[PDB]
Amino acid sequence: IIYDDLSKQAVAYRQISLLLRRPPGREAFPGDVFYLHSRLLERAARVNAEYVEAFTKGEVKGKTGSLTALPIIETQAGDVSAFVPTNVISITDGQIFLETNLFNAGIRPAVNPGISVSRVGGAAQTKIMKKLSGGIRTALAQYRELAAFSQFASDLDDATRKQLDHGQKVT
Amino acid sequence: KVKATGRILEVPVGRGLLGRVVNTLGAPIDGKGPLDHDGFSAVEAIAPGVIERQSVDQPVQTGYKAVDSMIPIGRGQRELIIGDR
Amino acid sequence: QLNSTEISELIKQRIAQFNVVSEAHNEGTIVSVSDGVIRIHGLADAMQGEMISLPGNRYAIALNLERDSVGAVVMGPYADLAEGM
Amino acid sequence: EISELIKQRIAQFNVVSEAHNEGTIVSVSDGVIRIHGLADAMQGEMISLPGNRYAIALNLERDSVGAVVMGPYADLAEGMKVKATGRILEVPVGRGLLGRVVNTLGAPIDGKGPLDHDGFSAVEAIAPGVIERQSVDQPVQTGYKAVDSMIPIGRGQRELIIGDRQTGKTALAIDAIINQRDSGIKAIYVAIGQKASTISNVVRKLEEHGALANTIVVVATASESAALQYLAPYAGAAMGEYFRDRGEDALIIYDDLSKQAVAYRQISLLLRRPPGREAFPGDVFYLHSRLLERAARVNAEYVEAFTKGEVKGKTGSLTALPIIETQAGDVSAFVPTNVISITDGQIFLETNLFNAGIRPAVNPGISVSRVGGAAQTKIMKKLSGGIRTALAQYRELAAFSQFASDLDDATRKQLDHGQKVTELLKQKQYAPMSVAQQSLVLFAAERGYLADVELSKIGSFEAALLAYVDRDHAPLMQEINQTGGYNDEIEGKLKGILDSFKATQ
Amino acid sequence: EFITVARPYAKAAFDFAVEHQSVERWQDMLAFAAEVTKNEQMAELLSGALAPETLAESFIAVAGEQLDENGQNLIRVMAENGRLNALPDVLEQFIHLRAVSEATAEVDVISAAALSEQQLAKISAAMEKRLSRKVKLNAKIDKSVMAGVIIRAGDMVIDGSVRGRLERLADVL
Amino acid sequence: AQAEIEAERKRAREELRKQVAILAVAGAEKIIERSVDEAANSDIVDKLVAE
Amino acid sequence: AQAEIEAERKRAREELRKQVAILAVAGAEKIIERSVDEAANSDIVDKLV
Amino acid sequence: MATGKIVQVIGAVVDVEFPQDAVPRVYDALEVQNGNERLVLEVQQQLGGGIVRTIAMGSSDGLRRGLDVKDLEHPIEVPVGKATLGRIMNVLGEPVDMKGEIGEEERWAIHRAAPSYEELSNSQELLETGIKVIDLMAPFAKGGKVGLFGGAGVGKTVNMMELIRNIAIEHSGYSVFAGVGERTREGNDFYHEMTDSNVIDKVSLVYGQMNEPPGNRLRVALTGLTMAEKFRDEGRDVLLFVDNIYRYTLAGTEVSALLGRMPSAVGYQPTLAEEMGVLQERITSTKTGSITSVQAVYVPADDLTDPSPATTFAHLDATVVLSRQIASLGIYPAVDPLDSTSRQLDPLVVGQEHYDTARGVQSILQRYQELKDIIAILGMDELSEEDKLVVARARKIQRFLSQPFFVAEVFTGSPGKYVSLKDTIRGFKGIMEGEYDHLPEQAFYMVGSIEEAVEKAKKL
Amino acid sequence: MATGKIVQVIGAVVDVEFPQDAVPRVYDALEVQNGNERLVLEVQQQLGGGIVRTIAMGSSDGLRRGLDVKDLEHPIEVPVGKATLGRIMNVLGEPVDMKGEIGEEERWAIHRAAP
Ligand SMILES: Nc1ncnc2c1ncn2[C@@H]1O[C@H](COP(=O)(O)OP(=O)(O)OP(=O)(O)O)[C@@H](O)[C@H]1O
Ligand SMILES: Nc1ncnc2c1ncn2[C@@H]1O[C@H](COP(=O)(O)OP(=O)(O)O)[C@@H](O)[C@H]1O
Ligand SMILES: [Mg+2]
Ligand SMILES: [Mg+2]
């Protein structure tokens, strides 16, 4: 399931809440905006085969059902400190950050590694992907560090130089 | 005058919704005729408890190299896509 | 539960005369004075944007016509004004 | 043994009725009770609840009193009867509670029996008037070389220890208290919103490393109600203001005036009072202002008219060291800027010096002392004037030191000497240093006896010099610790001592 | 609580009843208004959002045995402000105001058993010397007092029970 | 270590002394509840009604 | 000394159980001025143990 | 018999009117039939004549005005004792593991006062952990409080699972895990992990997840303490792990305005510091017994200045500040050695060589930080040689702080390493004394002892 | 004769109630016998019904809810002219020095219009 804009839901709930005269909180959002999105998102889950068999009154046996969710949020000028982004970032199992700078630079899809994580991680991969992807994750993060640290040194150590090139290749 | 039907909001649910564009109340808006629902379900329910879960070990493939290599998603995960406009 | 600008001598006048129109609609009494904003009672024949003439040669400009009071801003020194003028 | 005293308590009893006002509790919430009745209630009176708890009458509204509970409140209920005492809040005072740990009400939590206070004082009192107050010109030695050399404290001054978390604010204050073991300056430590195990660790250090006999410890832990935290510092000031009005010097430390401000904010918001800049109430300035302006030095006429002619030529004082915590070093926040305007000098404790290991991490140039060198003793005044200039010159020449060399030898000398005087002004936590020890160490830096020793041994050099001086020339140390005097004969003797010590290790 | 909104109307009524020498009639009129305002159907009419003019007619008609000056106006003006639930408080406000002007105190006495009517008359004359009012004692037989008496005189009280002294001694220990 | 033991002495004495205080006053309450007469209630009240 | 003060309290407790017999009848007449009934001393020993 | 009626239901807050005699006192429980569902309410305020305002310990949906309420004349009371070991419970101490009744001998009220000042007991009995950076920079004693501060995704949970592995298995005493506001998946993954490792027989688990109404998330922390305090009063040494202290304060924020309170500085409740104090002053080691506790602390927006993390800093004996920068750079665990500290880091109570090593390490890394932006703009060639030296040793030290964990093996595909305290000191002293100056930086990255640094250096 | 009563005290803010004929003008000064001292209040706002809201020019501690308040017709009036030279005064024009009474011939109100 893909929720297109949990931000505009938060905005609709704020409108309803204020018209009803409930006390406003930070940025005028009501306090149960965290409860709104948390009760919504914790519904996406995987359930053991005993739950499936109990629910379907015996019809289905040996199967685990699952619901996956991809909520989307818009931040203004990349501000993560705002209320609704803070709530959803706190609730979810990870983040994909998409950035204006990367998109304009032409890195599309404009994913920023090292600011995006998956807390399920390696468990949710095929064994081949698991094996190949572990090296990539570190290589790009440390590549951006070296690329910042060595903007001006015209000559460099080829150990570092090697890494730098490899990072441009994977990017 | 307002009557109080003592029932919470329920929505058409089933296999016959696959391919249908529907409003929040379950009314088709694609104009392709009525739904074929497998009964109704309640909109506001509670989630499965700790004992009823199972861990996530199955992948859902994005198809994007960056996502599926660096930020993998599994069947039951709750990934947030965040950024500017 | 705030007191909406109704007070005991005025209430006693309404107790004595259940219809208020016995006083001329051209006059009223100051009921509060707070930092320049003044709050008249009466003036059923006043319109928004009038020049309400205070005692002395001062004016106050009607800004709010509420159900039971006019709110005005005093053009000049306000500190001389009391209740009941 | 026991029960004849209980018989005596039966004897010491009152059998007749007496009369008072009586109120009924209308509401209970979050430590606030609304009381109907008490037409004779007055602002700041003590209301006696059932259970020997007090409440303080804060709001007087037209039909109800809003009172804050000084204790566990949760068992109070609507329709309980509350009796009006007629008392503005009093606390015990005297020498009998010198050496003991009490709460804001002055009840001992020490566990070591009751107090033998000589009487009581109002928690709220007006400060001494303009004409009743005398100029500060006597030292309070803190025992840290950096503070006592650069940022001198005088008997009556109100220095501010402002810094970030975990930078030694408490360590500096309690070392100040420990150095008073043998001065006539009594000491008070007020612990506002500190956690109880931290307080207990401090109190044990106070007995172990020296004397807790000279200090009154006032405690309001983070588990106690906001009313007790808020008032605590005023109760400590009433205990120190006892000594000031008797003719004796005292030193009070208030630990986290930011926590007192937070407690007052809670009380104000629960009483519905209109909010200000950071939700703090409008009179948050008038909280700390009226607290700290009780710290004063007071003339002999006042102390002779207060005591009614028992002491005659004394001048009492009460030095204050409030402690403030900034958040990420923000000096423009509301409570810090209030307190910085109220006080007269601050000891600014920067965090990245502390991380660097230069402990104590005082930061000169931003830390000043508005009382000046009239608070220093003479030998400390003569031997400290150059230190300020040498560190100022090291601030600017530190930038050069990072990456550059083969500068002019004038500059090279100046920079090096700056880096080694910086190395000299650091010391271990629970070692306080007497005026003679500080004096000679500064003389060693100022007269150049270190200029050939400008290497890592400076710590060993100081420890060896202090041992040597104690071993051979202690009557000089007695004479300097007595007088603080300085002259040509002392200057020559200090030269002779340094010249001899260089020949040793 | 309605005490604050009661106060302007209770003062206007009390200030008015002495202009027309009928305090005693006004008091029972308000006790009437307080008893009807408790009725379960009348409270539904009060909560029912009629406009004040037609609601005023729907209340004034049902309470017709009242003077033109008294009933039809006080009930209407409080109805426009929606204060009619204040009426049980307007009553007590009115009574207190009267007891104030008449220099009276409705002293209460509490005891484990009846007093000898010499004890009680002594109590009256002594409270009238302690205060400066004509007192009006009313007793209560509370067995927890065990012995002695409590005298309560409005906001002020005078404990002479043995139970209070027993629990005071228990804390002097 | 002597001062620490003296603190435990005072605390143990005080706890016993408060226990016996509570027993004494509960017994006095029962004695008051049973040993009483109307001429003694009136004798007490005649100290009260003087004020 | 902690075991000493324990056994000292144990020795005191029995002797204060005697003294508290006295105090109930003394104080329950003290609180009413008039003397208590000698007969009513029945049910006082209930306090004892 | 039932004795009160519901008069308002605004969101999660329910008002009940009672007779003006026998009004329920604060923190009492009340009971109402929400249809077939028995719903508990907790009393928060006595306001007005006969009315009490209360919070639902369950969903507020399905309540009508005029429902009857029965007042239980006690607080929420929970099972305590051995019968709680191996069982998951909710805030009310009802089993959620479907294994049947708890079978408790005794039940205790979750609201109780903290130990008196004279009850507190001093300790410096330093625990050893496998983690290099923590044992170097922030060692902690048995009976102390430890806080893990971080923003989202910096390693709070992975660290706490590692510390549970290293400390709890050697610990022979019972432990409590309080999952305040935890993700339901992570709670199931933990339960299965303990069940497989066979350590579930010495842990009691209380779980209040994100989906639950605010009263549950508010009060579940106190049920954790009430169980740990029962074990402490039996005289045991107890390990208490709290999954987020932050979502207790947040559960207070959500309901605070509906309770009528005026808002405070950042929208927090006016009672934030008292609410934190009353909870955190119960978590102490008394003369009878010791509680040792590890708490994770969420840092909203990654600013350590926000009132909620700012107040809790003043309660803890050790504070391990994790940082998002170091995590983004890929160094794990992401501990900031400059911000993190312990009050047990004293030369008197640690070995004086430990203290000297720690002061050296911190001095060096601070000296690197100020050079960073200078190199970034003006370039490395405009350092001097002794700074080029200290910038190299700084990088070697900042690699040797990294470590593989047994519980962070699934993420990275490598075995897990446990380093003894002595080996940690010996390594960092050797690096600072330059005995390994000639080895590359990667020879120190993701390794165990310095003997393993020379073995991997040989392979390099 | 003192013609008003205190009706509220909230911190430094005191509210007093007068007859409807007697209500003070906006910056008038009032005096209360708090304890044994005299407390000056400055009026700030005329709320309705004869209540005026005021700031206490001094300590607010010890005020009961029924004390009688005297209404001065002038604002705060202070000694002016040559007699003030060399003297230290408070806001109310009273000596905080101990030299003695200021021998003024004239007292002027602190509030007036600009030239
Ligand atoms: N001169 C010193 N030398 C070495 N260590 C010191 C010195 N002074 C203080 N410390 C150490 O610094 C740490 C913090 O000290 P302290 O607790 O006084 O800081 P703080 O600013 O009071 O922190 P908080 O504000 O959190 O109470 C303690 O471990 C203390 O032992
Ligand atoms: N030591 C580590 N080794 C490998 N990956 C780690 C480590 N620490 C954190 N991570 C990665 O960062 C994620 C976020 O940290 P985690 O503790 O799961 O959540 P939080 O830090 O918010 O509690 C982990 O799920 C994992 O993906
Ligand atoms: Mg500290
Ligand atoms: Mg986590």
UniProtKB/TrEMBL annotation, chain H:
GO cellular component terms, alphabetically, are: plasma membrane; proton-transporting ATP synthase complex
Q: Which organism is it from?
A: Escherichia coli O25b:H4
What is catalyzed by this enzyme?
ATP + H2O + 4 H(+)(in) = ADP + phosphate + 5 H(+)(out)
* Keywords (A to Z) from UniProt: ATP synthesis, ATP-binding, Cell inner membrane, Cell membrane, CF(1), Hydrogen ion transport, Hydrolase, Ion transport, Membrane, Nucleotide-binding, Translocase, Transport
What subcellular compartments does it reside in? Answer: Cell membrane; Membrane
A Gene Ontology molecular function term of the record: ATP binding
Q: What gene codes for this chain?
A: atpD
Q: What is the protein name given in its UniProt record?
A: ATP synthase subunit beta
Q: Where is the AAA+ ATPase domain?
A: 142-327
Sequence positions that bind ATP: 150-157
Recorded topology in the membrane = Peripheral membrane protein
Give its E.C. classification number: 7.1.2.2
Q: Which family does it belong to?
A: Belongs to the ATPase alpha/beta chains family. T3SS ATPase subfamily.
InterPro entries documented for this protein: AAA+_ATPase, ATP-synt_VA_C, ATP_synth_F1_bsu, ATPase_a/bsu_AS, ATPase_alpha/beta_chains, ATPase_F1/V1/A1_a/bsu_N, ATPase_F1/V1/A1_a/bsu_N_sf, ATPase_F1/V1/A1_a/bsu_nucl-bd
UniProt cross-references to PANTHER family, sorted A to Z: ATP SYNTHASE (PTHR15184), ATP SYNTHASE SUBUNIT BETA, MITOCHONDRIAL (PTHR15184:SF71)
The record's listing under Gene3D superfamilies reads: 2.40.10.170, Bovine Mitochondrial F1-atpase, Atp Synthase Beta Chain, Chain D, domain 3, P-loop containing nucleotide triphosphate hydrolases
